[PDB]
């Protein structure tokens, strides 16, 4: 079809955060079998393979911000991949990771499609600056090196002078903060971001959250959607084995509703699964619960709607 | 500057706990993450346990799952790490040492940098 | 759980030319582990943050190299107050194991 139609990017990296362990991203994303979960219904599923990330041995860091040089290579490297599937016609599975890989796994989906607009789907806002940091991470700082009105507020941090600011502060909805900083807070209020934090999450329910984002980005305009979904913006009762949990977050059920409402638009071009770590479950059945959520997470992205699916031949016979 | 003030040198012989204080001063707690790690004399070291101040992040190891538990003070910046079931292979000194806090807003600290002057823990009978 | 391996389990170098160290990780710990210098009865001082970069306070002489599986240390410039036991420790993956001890001897 026209959706379903997955080209898989590995990409295990995680020289954004510190918590060091997302390097097997994308091995226990594929162990678990979401590439043969994928294919029982219509998906032609091409793998692109894990993505080779060279070790950058004097990554002399920015003032706070820590690994410049080997993040931005990693998301130079993975935006040619990105452009490179959507080139084919597919929609660009990226699953890392880090949410330092978002800059590349945008990038390179606005170099084929420069009209996208972008669920975030994050505990955090992610929208921190190099000026406005206070860990320096930079699986805290993908969204500013994207929005075209950041520009001029960003200095030329080493490693990132491909990057193009390709979408506006108009084209991105935030769907489940609960754990902003107050230079965050500022710049979501001063660009005006449609945001849904967890209190309009709580007031509106998840149903009315989801048709105002549909709402919001294609109502004027069917434009190709780019759900970069993360794994702390779910609940830790669910994905406890993730970098920076924050309690109270969405619940299972409102995530498989997140992205049943994304899938039947049939406008999704473009999936990012990033922050699952499987080192930091205290249990092994934490990280089970965690992969496994993911994986459920990426399955009702692409079509496994919870009421069910039926191919369309006559079963009565 | 940047200190932890440990006490105290106290014996214990199989039976209660041996609950140390590790007092940070100088920076700014709860935006940090102060940790344990034992050594026996002639010995290696091993890490026993991290919790985050910034919210109550247990994260203990291996062997002590169980033995240990480790809670905050923050009104007065000490953090504290219990025992249960002694024994006397834990004739140790307990270090305790500040990973930093693996939040969001915690600054980036991987290194152990203030270092507690450590707590002479025999345990016996 | 990574065994940090140090592969000069003593050593003795008079005061005078380099001492490079050891430290083998089991995995790709990828320039992210540290460096100490528990003097016998004190609290282990840290050398080095994350295998270079000599964290805030050391004098001159102790940059170390890595990225990512064998890390060295060097201490170029001996200087007889040296004399301790140095341990590599590997911090981003859990749990955090430090690794054997480096006794750096006095050479007569």
């Known amino acids: 079809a026209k959706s379903r139609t997955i080209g898989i990017i590995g990409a295990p990296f995680s020289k954004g955060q510190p918590r060091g362990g997302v390097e097997e991203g994308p091995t226990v994303l594929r162990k678990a079998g979401l590439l043969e979960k994928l294919k029982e219904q219509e998906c032609d599923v091409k793998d692109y393979g894990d993505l080779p990330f060279a070790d950058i041995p004097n990554d002399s860091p920015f003032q706070i911000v820590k690994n410049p040089r080997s993040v931005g290579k990693a998301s130079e490297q993975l935006a040619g991949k990105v452009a490179e599937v959507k080139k084919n016609g597919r929609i660009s599975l990226v699953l890392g990771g880090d949410h330092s890989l978002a800059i590349g796994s945008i990038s390179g989906h606005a170099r084929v499609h420069p009209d996208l607009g972008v669920i975030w789907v994050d505990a955090h806002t992610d929208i921190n600056t190099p000026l406005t940091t206070t860990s320096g991470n930079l699986h805290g700082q993908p969204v500013s090196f994207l929005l075209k009105e950041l520009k001029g507020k960003i200095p030329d941090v080493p490693g990132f002078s491909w990057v193009t600011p390709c979408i506006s502060a108009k084209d991105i909805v935030y769907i489940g903060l609960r754990d902003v900083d107050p230079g965050e807070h500022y710049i979501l209020k001063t660009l005006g971001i449609k945001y849904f934090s967890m209190t309009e999450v709580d007031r509106l329910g998840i149903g009315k959250v989801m048709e105002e984002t549909l709402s919001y980005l294609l109502g004027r305009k069917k434009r190709p959607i780019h759900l970069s979904f993360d794994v702390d913006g779910l609940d830790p009762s669910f994905t406890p084995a993730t970098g920076t949990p924050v309690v109270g977050g969405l619940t299972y059920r409102e995530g498989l509703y997140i992205t049943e409402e994304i899938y039947k638009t049939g406008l999704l071009s473009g999936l990012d699964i990033m922050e699952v770590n499987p080192s930091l479950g205290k249990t092994p059945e934490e990280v089970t619960r965690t992969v496994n959520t993911a994986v459920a997470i990426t399955l009702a992205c692409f079509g496994l709607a919870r009421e069910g699916n039926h191919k369309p031949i006559d079963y009565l016979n | 500057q940047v200190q932890l003030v440990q006490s105290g040198a106290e014996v214990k012989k199989p039976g209660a706990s041996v609950k140390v204080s590790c007092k940070a001063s100088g920076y700014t707690f709860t935006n940090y993450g102060i940790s344990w790690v034992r050594q026996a004399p002639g010995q290696g070291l091993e890490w026993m346990g991290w919790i985050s101040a910034y919210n109550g992040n247990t994260n203990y190891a291996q062997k002590l799952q169980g033995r240990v538990t480790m809670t905050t003070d923050t009104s007065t910046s000490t953090a504290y790490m219990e025992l249960r079931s002694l024994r006397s292979d834990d004739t140790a000194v307990y270090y305790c040492?500040?990973?930093?806090?693996?939040?969001?807003?915690?600054?980036?600290?991987?290194?152990?940098?203030?270092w507690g002057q450590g707590t002479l823990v025999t345990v016996s009978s | 759980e990574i065994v940090m391996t140090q592969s000069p389990a003593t050593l003795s170098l008079s005061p005078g030319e380099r001492a490079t160290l050891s430290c083998r990780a089991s995995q790709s710990v990828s320039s992210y582990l540290a460096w100490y210098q528990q003097k016998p009865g004190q609290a282990p001082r840290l050398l080095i943050y994350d295998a270079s970069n000599r964290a805030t306070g050391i004098p001159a002489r102790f940059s170390g190299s890595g990225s990512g599986t064998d890390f060295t240390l060097t201490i170029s410039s001996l200087e007889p107050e040296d004399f301790a036991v140095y341990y590599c420790q590997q911090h981003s993956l859990l749990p955090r194991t430090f690794g054997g001890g480096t006794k750096v001897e006095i050479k007569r």
């Open positions: 040492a500040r990973e930093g806090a693996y939040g969001y807003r915690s600054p980036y600290h991987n290194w152990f940098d203030p």
